[PDB]
């Protein structure tokens, strides 16, 4: 736009490009997402403006002009992917990992109680600041990374539930802990099969109805579930217990964000400050 001064491109989603920009009039620094072009999502979007929570990136303005849709967000200084990469040699301290997971669960508990789903959580849209907060960014409306996709989506479910976000966050939690992506698939079927090889091929016993799903094939290989202690070695039993509940195959058995916040893993949660290199 003319009201903004593009400082630099900082990302790109499936819907548009995000820039760090300065309001030529207020001097305010913001994140500006440009979507190159409906009359339905507009409400859905305009509604996201109401959402106000410490762990949700604030949507400041929505501007529809010249076949373009611009979303103005408060600017955060770094995303979790960059932070994880910067922390690869030493690893993120467990207390900070726990604080981040706890805050993200609060954010999800909030959006889910307002019937809002994210649908595409990943390290690149989890933003952090110098004060130790972490926030959910770039909510998805009703090379693409499939690493955090819930199995029901991969199997063709038509209606997503809040459980898809818990799964994605569980995958991110594991990655912060091990410094290795949990399920790094490079195709939908490779993604699905990597999940199967680790958690075991699901069946009607652990996931009632799974064999009736759109993309389920009786021909799927039958892998046995791997020992969970081999999945996230550096994580204590409270952490492993919580992770296993976030990664249940059955959407209805998968733990809710609200219930997760009450898990024993968070008994000693604190809010450490990260060492950020900006």
Ligand X SMILES: Nc1nc(Nc2ccc(S(N)(=O)=O)cc2)sc1C(=O)c1ccc2ccccc2c1
Active site residues: 120
> Interface with ligand X includes 194 (CB under 6 A)?
no
187 to 71, 144, 148, 168, 220: CA distances (angstroms): 30, 10, 12, 17, 15
d(CA 233, CA 178): 8
> Interface with ligand X includes 125 (CB under 6 A)?
yes
> Interface with ligand X includes 21 (CB under 6 A)?
no
Between 57 and 260, CB nearer to ligand X: 57
Candidate ranges 75-83, 107-115, 175-183, 266-274; the one touching ligand X (CB under 6 A): 75-83
What is the nearest approach in angstroms of ligand X to the Cβ of residue 104?
Answer: 15
Could you please report the per-residue DSSP string of 31-65? Answer: EEEEEE---SHHHHHHHHTT---TTB--EEEEEEE
Phi, psi of 8, deg, nearest 5: -175, 160
> Interface with ligand X includes 126 (CB under 6 A)?
no
> Interface with ligand X includes 138 (CB under 6 A)?
yes
> Interface with ligand X includes 103 (CB under 6 A)?
no
- Neighbouring C-beta atoms of residue 248, cutoff 10 Å: 20
Q: Which of 4, 70, 75, 102 binds ligand X (CB under 6 A)?
A: 75
151-155 own/partner pairs: CB under 8 Å, 24+ apart: 151/192, 151/195, 151/202, 151/249, 152/213, 152/251, 154/188, 154/191, 154/192, 154/195, 154/215, 155/192, 155/210, 155/213, 155/214, 155/215, 155/216
> Interface with ligand X includes 34 (CB under 6 A)?
no
> Interface with ligand X includes 48 (CB under 6 A)?
no
What is the nearest approach in angstroms of ligand X to the Cβ of residue 119?
Answer: 13
What is the nearest approach in angstroms of ligand X to the Cβ of residue 132?
Answer: 16
238 is in an annotated binding site: no
Binding residues (CB under 6 A) for ligand X: these are 10-11, 13, 18, 31, 33, 57, 73, 75-79, 82, 124-125, 127, 137-138
Q: Which residues carry a binding-site annotation for ATP?
A: 10-18, 33, 74-76, 79, 122-125, 138
């Amino acid at each position: 736009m003319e009201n903004f001064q593009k400082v630099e491109k900082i990302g790109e989603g499936t819907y548009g490009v995000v820039y760090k920009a300065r309001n030529k009039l207020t001097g305010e620094v913001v994140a500006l997402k440009k979507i190159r072009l409906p009359s339905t999502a507009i409400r859905e979007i305009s509604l996201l403006k109401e959402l106000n929570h410490p762990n949700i990136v604030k949507l400041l303005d929505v501007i529809h002009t010249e076949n373009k849709l611009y979303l103005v967000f408060e600017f955060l200084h770094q995303d979790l992917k960059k932070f994880m990469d910067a922390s690869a040699l030493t690893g993120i301290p467990l207390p900070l990992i726990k604080s981040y997971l706890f805050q993200l669960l609060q954010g999800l508990a909030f959006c889910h109680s307002h019937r809002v789903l994210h649908r595409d959580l990943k390290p690149q849209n989890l933003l952090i600041n110098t004060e130790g907060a972490i926030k959910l960014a770039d909510f998805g409306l009703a090379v693409v990374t499939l690493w955090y996709r819930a199995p029901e989506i991969l199997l063709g479910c038509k209606y997503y539930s809040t459980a898809v976000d818990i799964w994605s966050l569980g995958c991110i939690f594991a990655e912060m802990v091990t410094r290795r992506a949990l399920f790094p698939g490079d195709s939908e079927i490779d993604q699905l099969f990597r999940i199967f090889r680790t958690l075991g091929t699901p069946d009607e016993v652990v996931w009632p109805g799974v064999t009736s799903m759109p993309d389920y094939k009786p021909s799927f290989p039958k892998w046995a579930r791997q020992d969970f202690s081999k999945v996230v070695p550096p994580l204590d039993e409270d952490g492993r217990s919580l992770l296993s509940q976030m990664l249940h195959y059955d959407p209805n058995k998968r733990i809710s964000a609200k219930a997760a916040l009450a898990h024993p893993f968070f008994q000693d949660v604190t809010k450490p400050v990260p060492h950020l290199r900006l």
